[PDB]
Design a protein around this ligand. Structure first.
Ligand SMILES: C[C@@H]1[C@H]([C@H](C(=O)O)[C@@H](C)O)N=C(C(=O)O)[C@H]1S[C@@H]1CN[C@H](CNS(N)(=O)=O)C1
Ligand code: NA
Ligand code: NA
Ligand code: NA
Ligand code: NA
Ligand code: NA
Ligand code: NA
Ligand code: NA
Ligand SMILES: [Zn+2]
Ligand SMILES: [Zn+2]
Length: 259
Protein backbone atom coordinates (compact mmCIF):
# COMPACT_ATOMS: atom_id res chain seq x y z
CA UNK A 1 0.00 0.00 0.00
CA UNK A 2 2.72 2.41 -1.08
CA UNK A 3 1.64 5.68 -2.65
CA UNK A 4 2.14 4.41 -6.18
CA UNK A 5 1.05 0.79 -5.71
CA UNK A 6 -1.37 -0.84 -8.10
CA UNK A 7 -4.82 -1.42 -6.65
CA UNK A 8 -7.80 -3.12 -8.33
CA UNK A 9 -10.54 -0.48 -8.61
CA UNK A 10 -13.96 -0.98 -7.09
CA UNK A 11 -17.34 0.69 -6.85
CA UNK A 12 -18.04 2.14 -3.44
CA UNK A 13 -21.67 3.26 -4.05
CA UNK A 14 -23.67 3.93 -7.24
CA UNK A 15 -21.49 5.99 -9.57
CA UNK A 16 -18.68 6.56 -7.03
CA UNK A 17 -15.68 4.35 -7.88
CA UNK A 18 -12.31 4.01 -6.12
CA UNK A 19 -9.58 4.30 -8.76
CA UNK A 20 -6.59 5.26 -6.63
CA UNK A 21 -3.47 3.37 -5.59
CA UNK A 22 -2.97 1.07 -2.63
CA UNK A 23 -1.85 4.07 -0.55
CA UNK A 24 -3.64 7.14 -1.92
CA UNK A 25 -7.30 7.67 -2.73
CA UNK A 26 -8.62 8.78 -6.09
CA UNK A 27 -12.26 8.64 -7.06
CA UNK A 28 -14.07 8.54 -10.39
CA UNK A 29 -17.59 9.96 -10.25
CA UNK A 30 -19.15 8.66 -13.49
CA UNK A 31 -22.00 9.66 -15.75
CA UNK A 32 -23.21 9.05 -19.29
CA UNK A 33 -22.24 12.67 -20.11
CA UNK A 34 -18.71 12.39 -18.73
CA UNK A 35 -16.85 11.96 -15.49
CA UNK A 36 -15.12 13.77 -12.64
CA UNK A 37 -11.84 12.47 -11.16
CA UNK A 38 -10.89 13.43 -7.63
CA UNK A 39 -7.10 13.55 -7.13
CA UNK A 40 -4.23 12.06 -9.16
CA UNK A 41 -2.06 10.24 -6.60
CA UNK A 42 1.68 10.39 -7.40
CA UNK A 43 3.36 10.92 -10.74
CA UNK A 44 4.00 7.14 -11.03
CA UNK A 45 0.51 6.55 -9.67
CA UNK A 46 -1.10 8.35 -12.59
CA UNK A 47 -0.43 5.24 -14.68
CA UNK A 48 -2.31 3.21 -12.09
CA UNK A 49 -5.25 5.64 -11.96
CA UNK A 50 -5.53 5.74 -15.77
CA UNK A 51 -5.53 1.93 -16.04
CA UNK A 52 -8.05 1.76 -13.19
CA UNK A 53 -10.49 4.16 -14.91
CA UNK A 54 -10.31 2.02 -18.01
CA UNK A 55 -10.78 -1.17 -15.97
CA UNK A 56 -14.04 0.28 -14.64
CA UNK A 57 -15.24 0.62 -18.25
CA UNK A 58 -14.64 4.34 -18.77
CA UNK A 59 -12.69 6.38 -21.33
CA UNK A 60 -10.03 8.85 -20.20
CA UNK A 61 -11.27 11.32 -22.83
CA UNK A 62 -14.60 11.45 -21.01
CA UNK A 63 -13.01 12.77 -17.77
CA UNK A 64 -13.90 16.48 -17.88
CA UNK A 65 -12.73 17.74 -14.50
CA UNK A 66 -9.95 16.74 -12.06
CA UNK A 67 -10.65 17.99 -8.54
CA UNK A 68 -7.70 18.50 -6.21
CA UNK A 69 -7.86 18.10 -2.44
CA UNK A 70 -4.45 19.61 -1.90
CA UNK A 71 -1.17 20.28 -3.64
CA UNK A 72 1.38 17.76 -2.30
CA UNK A 73 3.16 15.11 -4.34
CA UNK A 74 1.24 12.19 -2.86
CA UNK A 75 -2.24 13.46 -3.89
CA UNK A 76 -1.44 15.84 -6.74
CA UNK A 77 1.75 14.42 -8.26
CA UNK A 78 -0.28 12.51 -10.86
CA UNK A 79 -2.63 15.35 -11.75
CA UNK A 80 -0.47 16.74 -14.57
CA UNK A 81 -0.21 13.42 -16.27
CA UNK A 82 -3.91 12.73 -15.84
CA UNK A 83 -4.71 16.20 -17.19
CA UNK A 84 -2.69 15.48 -20.36
CA UNK A 85 -4.30 12.05 -20.81
CA UNK A 86 -7.86 13.37 -20.38
CA UNK A 87 -7.90 17.02 -21.49
CA UNK A 88 -9.71 17.81 -18.24
CA UNK A 89 -9.76 21.11 -16.38
CA UNK A 90 -8.14 20.98 -12.93
CA UNK A 91 -10.07 22.67 -10.09
CA UNK A 92 -8.54 23.63 -6.75
CA UNK A 93 -8.72 26.07 -3.85
CA UNK A 94 -7.43 29.49 -4.80
CA UNK A 95 -4.33 29.39 -2.64
CA UNK A 96 -3.15 26.05 -4.09
CA UNK A 97 -3.53 26.98 -7.78
CA UNK A 98 0.06 28.24 -8.13
CA UNK A 99 1.48 25.11 -6.50
CA UNK A 100 -0.48 22.83 -8.86
CA UNK A 101 0.88 24.83 -11.83
CA UNK A 102 4.52 24.81 -10.72
CA UNK A 103 4.73 21.65 -8.58
CA UNK A 104 6.45 23.63 -5.82
CA UNK A 105 4.81 24.21 -2.41
CA UNK A 106 5.40 27.69 -0.86
CA UNK A 107 7.09 28.79 2.34
CA UNK A 108 3.72 29.20 4.04
CA UNK A 109 3.37 25.34 4.05
CA UNK A 110 4.26 23.83 7.47
CA UNK A 111 6.17 21.09 5.66
CA UNK A 112 8.22 23.65 3.56
CA UNK A 113 11.79 22.50 3.70
CA UNK A 114 10.78 18.81 3.63
CA UNK A 115 8.44 18.41 0.64
CA UNK A 116 9.43 17.07 -2.76
CA UNK A 117 8.39 18.90 -5.87
CA UNK A 118 6.11 17.25 -8.41
CA UNK A 119 5.10 17.82 -12.07
CA UNK A 120 3.27 21.05 -12.75
CA UNK A 121 -0.15 20.83 -14.37
CA UNK A 122 -1.84 22.74 -17.17
CA UNK A 123 -5.45 24.02 -17.11
CA UNK A 124 -5.64 24.81 -13.38
CA UNK A 125 -8.55 27.00 -12.18
CA UNK A 126 -9.75 28.20 -8.78
CA UNK A 127 -13.03 27.37 -7.01
CA UNK A 128 -14.46 29.13 -3.97
CA UNK A 129 -15.84 27.80 -0.71
CA UNK A 130 -19.35 26.48 -1.33
CA UNK A 131 -19.06 26.50 -5.10
CA UNK A 132 -20.84 23.85 -7.21
CA UNK A 133 -19.06 22.01 -9.99
CA UNK A 134 -21.57 20.70 -12.53
CA UNK A 135 -21.17 18.18 -15.33
CA UNK A 136 -24.29 16.72 -16.83
CA UNK A 137 -26.19 15.16 -13.92
CA UNK A 138 -23.15 15.46 -11.60
CA UNK A 139 -23.03 18.10 -8.90
CA UNK A 140 -20.01 18.33 -6.65
CA UNK A 141 -19.62 20.97 -3.92
CA UNK A 142 -16.28 22.48 -2.82
CA UNK A 143 -15.77 23.06 0.90
CA UNK A 144 -12.72 25.04 1.98
CA UNK A 145 -10.75 22.94 4.44
CA UNK A 146 -7.40 24.77 4.89
CA UNK A 147 -4.70 24.05 7.41
CA UNK A 148 -2.63 21.23 6.00
CA UNK A 149 -2.36 23.56 2.95
CA UNK A 150 -3.99 26.97 2.47
CA UNK A 151 -6.02 25.90 -0.58
CA UNK A 152 -7.25 22.52 0.71
CA UNK A 153 -10.71 21.51 -0.51
CA UNK A 154 -13.02 18.71 0.72
CA UNK A 155 -15.48 17.68 -2.03
CA UNK A 156 -19.04 16.40 -1.54
CA UNK A 157 -21.78 14.89 -3.74
CA UNK A 158 -24.67 12.43 -3.74
CA UNK A 159 -24.59 8.99 -5.33
CA UNK A 160 -27.63 6.74 -5.79
CA UNK A 161 -28.49 3.13 -6.57
CA UNK A 162 -32.04 2.69 -8.03
CA UNK A 163 -32.96 5.86 -6.25
CA UNK A 164 -31.45 5.08 -2.83
CA UNK A 165 -28.99 7.93 -2.26
CA UNK A 166 -26.05 8.61 0.05
CA UNK A 167 -24.04 11.74 0.80
CA UNK A 168 -20.39 11.09 -0.14
CA UNK A 169 -17.44 13.11 1.13
CA UNK A 170 -13.89 13.03 -0.30
CA UNK A 171 -12.16 14.31 2.82
CA UNK A 172 -8.99 16.38 2.45
CA UNK A 173 -6.21 15.88 4.93
CA UNK A 174 -6.64 17.81 8.21
CA UNK A 175 -3.23 16.94 9.64
CA UNK A 176 -0.83 19.22 11.48
CA UNK A 177 2.56 18.02 10.24
CA UNK A 178 5.69 20.02 9.73
CA UNK A 179 9.32 20.38 9.03
CA UNK A 180 11.54 20.22 12.10
CA UNK A 181 12.16 23.96 12.04
CA UNK A 182 8.42 24.86 12.16
CA UNK A 183 6.42 25.84 15.24
CA UNK A 184 2.63 25.76 14.95
CA UNK A 185 2.42 27.97 18.05
CA UNK A 186 4.07 30.74 16.00
CA UNK A 187 1.68 30.51 13.03
CA UNK A 188 -1.78 31.61 14.03
CA UNK A 189 -3.33 31.56 10.52
CA UNK A 190 -2.50 27.83 10.11
CA UNK A 191 -3.89 26.97 13.54
CA UNK A 192 -7.07 28.97 12.97
CA UNK A 193 -7.49 27.37 9.54
CA UNK A 194 -7.10 23.86 10.90
CA UNK A 195 -9.63 24.55 13.67
CA UNK A 196 -12.14 26.01 11.25
CA UNK A 197 -11.71 22.96 9.08
CA UNK A 198 -12.30 20.50 11.92
CA UNK A 199 -15.58 22.31 12.60
CA UNK A 200 -16.62 22.38 8.94
CA UNK A 201 -15.87 18.71 8.38
CA UNK A 202 -17.63 17.49 11.52
CA UNK A 203 -20.81 19.34 10.35
CA UNK A 204 -20.89 17.79 6.81
CA UNK A 205 -23.68 15.51 5.65
CA UNK A 206 -21.54 12.41 5.52
CA UNK A 207 -22.87 8.94 4.88
CA UNK A 208 -19.69 7.70 3.12
CA UNK A 209 -16.31 9.29 3.73
CA UNK A 210 -13.36 8.58 1.49
CA UNK A 211 -10.24 10.07 3.08
CA UNK A 212 -7.34 11.24 0.89
CA UNK A 213 -5.23 8.67 2.75
CA UNK A 214 -7.77 5.85 2.59
CA UNK A 215 -6.78 4.20 5.84
CA UNK A 216 -7.85 7.33 7.65
CA UNK A 217 -11.41 5.98 7.44
CA UNK A 218 -10.32 2.31 7.44
CA UNK A 219 -10.92 1.79 3.73
CA UNK A 220 -9.27 -1.61 3.53
CA UNK A 221 -11.03 -3.03 6.59
CA UNK A 222 -14.27 -1.69 5.11
CA UNK A 223 -13.60 -3.25 1.70
CA UNK A 224 -12.94 -6.63 3.36
CA UNK A 225 -16.20 -6.29 5.28
CA UNK A 226 -17.98 -5.40 2.01
CA UNK A 227 -17.20 -8.79 0.50
CA UNK A 228 -19.74 -10.21 2.98
CA UNK A 229 -21.83 -7.15 3.98
CA UNK A 230 -22.03 -5.38 0.59
CA UNK A 231 -21.40 -1.65 0.19
CA UNK A 232 -23.12 -0.73 3.42
CA UNK A 233 -19.64 -1.49 4.84
CA UNK A 234 -18.50 1.90 3.47
CA UNK A 235 -21.44 3.71 5.09
CA UNK A 236 -20.81 5.25 8.50
CA UNK A 237 -22.35 8.64 9.13
CA UNK A 238 -19.93 9.34 11.97
CA UNK A 239 -16.87 9.09 9.78
CA UNK A 240 -16.42 12.80 9.06
CA UNK A 241 -16.83 13.51 12.75
CA UNK A 242 -14.10 10.95 13.43
CA UNK A 243 -11.70 12.32 10.79
CA UNK A 244 -12.16 15.82 12.28
CA UNK A 245 -11.67 14.53 15.85
CA UNK A 246 -8.44 12.87 14.83
CA UNK A 247 -7.28 16.11 13.24
CA UNK A 248 -8.10 18.05 16.37
CA UNK A 249 -6.26 15.50 18.51
CA UNK A 250 -3.15 15.65 16.33
CA UNK A 251 -3.08 19.46 16.52
CA UNK A 252 -3.71 19.56 20.28
CA UNK A 253 -1.02 16.92 20.90
CA UNK A 254 1.39 19.04 18.82
CA UNK A 255 0.58 22.37 20.50
CA UNK A 256 1.04 20.73 23.89
CA UNK A 257 4.39 19.29 22.81
CA UNK A 258 5.47 22.83 21.79
CA UNK A 259 4.69 24.42 25.16
C1 LIG B 1 3.01 13.48 6.45
C2 LIG B 1 1.90 12.56 5.97
C3 LIG B 1 1.80 12.38 4.43
C4 LIG B 1 2.90 12.89 3.48
C5 LIG B 1 4.19 12.17 3.82
O1 LIG B 1 4.13 10.93 4.20
O2 LIG B 1 5.28 12.66 3.57
C6 LIG B 1 3.18 14.41 3.40
C7 LIG B 1 3.67 14.77 1.99
O3 LIG B 1 2.04 15.22 3.73
N1 LIG B 1 0.51 12.97 4.04
C8 LIG B 1 -0.15 13.29 5.06
C9 LIG B 1 -1.51 13.80 4.92
O4 LIG B 1 -2.22 13.94 5.95
O5 LIG B 1 -1.96 14.08 3.73
C10 LIG B 1 0.50 13.08 6.40
S1 LIG B 1 -0.40 12.03 7.55
C11 LIG B 1 -0.95 10.65 6.58
C12 LIG B 1 -2.03 9.92 7.37
N2 LIG B 1 -1.56 8.55 7.53
C13 LIG B 1 -0.64 8.26 6.41
C14 LIG B 1 0.22 7.05 6.77
N3 LIG B 1 0.03 6.56 8.17
S2 LIG B 1 -1.16 5.48 8.51
N4 LIG B 1 -1.04 4.23 7.49
O6 LIG B 1 -0.96 4.84 9.80
O7 LIG B 1 -2.45 6.15 8.43
C15 LIG B 1 0.10 9.59 6.20
NA1 NA C 1 -4.19 -1.00 -10.44
NA1 NA D 1 -0.97 18.91 -17.53
NA1 NA E 1 -7.74 22.31 -3.64
NA1 NA F 1 -0.06 25.52 -1.68
NA1 NA G 1 -2.89 26.44 -15.46
NA1 NA H 1 0.77 20.36 7.83
NA1 NA I 1 -13.87 6.29 11.05
ZN1 LIG J 1 -0.36 16.66 2.12
ZN1 LIG K 1 -0.79 13.10 2.11
Amino acid sequence: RDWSSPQQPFTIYGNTHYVGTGGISAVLLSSPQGHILVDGTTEKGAQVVAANIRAMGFKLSDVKYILSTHSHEDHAGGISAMQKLTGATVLAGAANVDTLRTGVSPKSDPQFGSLSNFPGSAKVRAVADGELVKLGPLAVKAHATPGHTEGGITWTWQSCEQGKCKDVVFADSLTAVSADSYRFSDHPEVVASLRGSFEAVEKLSCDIAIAAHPEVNDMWTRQQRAAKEGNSAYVDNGACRAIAAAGRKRLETRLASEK
